[PDB]
Subunit: 261 residues, 4 copies
């Protein structure tokens, strides 16, 4: 029905976008970037991430599709050569939807801000040492000293989380994963070390010890937050929906990206 297309903005992606719009013009399809029902991202995973955040207030009404004009992306998992086939199948419709879990981040001050992540949310200090108390379902778990912390969605586990030693999780698992960035461990300072995987309805709370200023990232976006009293992580009730047109299993996607393609 209603659809829009975002572009990475290079020549290859802009022209693929115009060609798909022309191809869409031959069906009962209406270009609408205010209330689209299909969002096509042409570029890479960064382009797809921006498309998700552009429309994160209408996630239940939108099915996303990614086309990678560079190397294979984990979200942009369609090749440009299949664009005409994609146009045809999209126009007809009757496609199945698959849903991936998302991460909710709440930042409290001394007022509240909430953010939704498709990959992950990270916390680092403003410049000095990073020290937070990690509280799991109101239980004090550890005092973390180090570079920072990363809380990843399942589909995010192949991104920053992977570089930090985290496990790769199949996205059908409604969970979030917390990994450490360079923790100090000696006689007096102790962290768990291992990645931690949390189910739905578990709340991980980060509470400042001394400094209350933190650089908080949500996917690409990174903002300095001041006078922070708490950072709360939990699996969101909201999910992102993908239009699926053929089988591209997650573990094959992992294989193609990290082992060989």
């Amino acid at each position: 029905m209603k659809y829009m297309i975002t572009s990475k903005g290079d020549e290859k992606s802009d022209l693929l976008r115009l060609n798909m719009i022309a191809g869409f013009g031959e069906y009962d399809m209406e270009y609408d970037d205010v209330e689209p029902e299909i969002v096509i991202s042409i570029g890479g995973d960064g382009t797809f991430l921006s498309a998700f955040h552009q429309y994160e207030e209408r996630l239940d009404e939108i099915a996303f599709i990614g086309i990678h004009t560079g190397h294979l992306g984990f979200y942009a998992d369609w090749r440009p050569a299949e664009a005409d086939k994609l146009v045809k199948l999209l126009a007809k419709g009757e496609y199945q939807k698959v849903s991936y879990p998302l991460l909710k981040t709440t930042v409290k001050y001394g007022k509240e801000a909430t953010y939704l992540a498709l990959n992950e949310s990270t916390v680092k200090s403003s410049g000095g040492p990073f020290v937070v108390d990690v509280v799991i379902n109101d239980i004090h778990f550890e005092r973390f000293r180090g570079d920072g912390l990363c809380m990843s969605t399942p589909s995010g586990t192949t991104a920053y989380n992977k570089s930090l030693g985290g496990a790769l999780m199949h996205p059908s698992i409604e969970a979030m994963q917390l990994t450490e960035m360079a923790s100090i461990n000696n006689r007096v300072y102790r962290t768990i070390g291992s990645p931690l995987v949390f189910p739905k309805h578990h709340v991980v709370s980060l509470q400042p010890v001394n400094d209350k200023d933190f650089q908080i990232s949500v996917d690409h976006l990174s903002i300095l937050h001041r006078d922070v009293q708490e950072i709360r992580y939990e699996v969101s009730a909201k999910k992102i929906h993908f239009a699926r047109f053929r089988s591209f299993p997650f573990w094959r996607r992992v294989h193609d990206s990290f082992i060989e393609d």
Copy 2:
């Protein structure tokens, strides 16, 4: 109703066992180690593991309880001082049950053997190099060369899995986790490296490349298997049930064991 008690076999555990039996004699409780409904393990996690495997054919009819006479165990999570309180609460009954997921291992030859794991199942070679093809839901994922592989239950993630870099997973997540033991990675040999977390109904199959003899462990038990054609891992449909009498959250149990107690 019917109950039995296993002991580590040292003086401390044998006498605690006899005292609980005497205390149980004052209620409508019958000692039966053929068809018990409550299985009390007195000792450590190894003692608890043997109790589980002693009765793994009646898991749906049994609630397990562990008493640790040494350091705190992840399964034997009751102190000996609470034994009298445990007797009293057990006798009355009306206790809630909590269930943890289990791992099913199938070993095929050229005939079939199946095993149930509460912690993990590992595969190593008989002596020479270990090389297996890793197949996920019939998709060839990687050729693994190294010391071996470990497939862990959620409650097993704090055991061997943790020492191999795996993530700690809350046991409410029905999953299994595959970690690598010292993989070779160079130009010609590529593994994923990261731990992999699999949901229910995903089948991980290990298939020999040259040598077909493997040392396979299931919890404590380790057996040399010969003429192996395939090793299949999946989350079991069977679950282990614990009698719960108070709140001892998993993440607090993790905290008490690895951070401080």
Copy 3:
């Protein structure tokens, strides 16, 4: 002969400093913080690091001593109770000196700046992605994409380097060690992963790929450098000298700090 004493600045360290000065007044010892021959640091390792950098232009004329008024430090390895014994032994003299290797960092622009490190020097980006070409003795070794890189002295290996997975090296080895911070590794991006240990006279050069702005740290000090053409690492020809009065072996120091004391 000539000596000075730096203090962490809390009450405990200031008063210990005044007491040692009073005790030194009973010997042929002259307080001189312009050209001291003995530099006593009272506080922690951060205090010792500042003392080293305060006098890094007279390293060949100075023997350093650290007193830890908090937990045991790797550089401040004397307890406050031994201060009177230290005064007496220092005044007499005839102490042996031990030398630790240092790291030289050269930053080139489009002009040159050089820095000396006792712990390590790290490179991170100004905000966006960090991408550098790593060149070893003029040989292009890898293109590094990730959070950053850390080059550690031997005595620094128990500090940031340790938290990044680096090896602990005995300080008698004239070397530097390069560790990765969260590198991306997929089909198209490849780093070595492993820590790299370099002997004297090997030059590791970091060369920008796109962005030329970098946040460069040397021990505690962190500075944003702009218009960087190259960052060069090599083991310095200069060494830091410690006054030794009893045996405190490095591996015992490692044991006391990380295993138990």
Copy 4:
């Protein structure tokens, strides 16, 4: 002068060997596999390792050369196409020698056995738990519980040591590196975790706690030792010598093997 050639034993390596012998027949070169001065290994690193151990009692009289008929090896670093060039340059002589450090392993019982390693020596248990006390220069450093331990030469650091998280060390550094295999770390059990790098004249001693039977490997060779009282590691005074005919820097060799070739 005197020379011999070992072969992997496949058709490619046997015929290359015969062709080099025929080519050597045109110079003042004598085939002697009793007291050779040049040892040519044709095959892979395993073939080279066997050549080293075949002649480990005449290391000071022998210069080794490796030809890799498969993928590039770290010791067999010459291609078969250069065999004729190698024959010519070898016959003339006047080649430079480069030396790599070696590892000495002493096994004491209740009698003594000593072994020389070019890659590494590892210790594992006979079947049950592996527990040893790690003693560094007579100082008790840690009690290690886990799968085992690996002590690597510098040139060995790119082999098993690399798969265990160890650092890659340039072979001009006279050192040995100790890495852990899956150590248990909790409240009651503590190891250092990090790889440890030891200079010449440091002695690392492994002492049994309960079981005295250990599976000890030296390069390819693996032997069950019984009634072990101590395992002692130190950098050997003996070195292996390579004939060098052109520049093939170690870090380029690392690059070609792990990054790209």
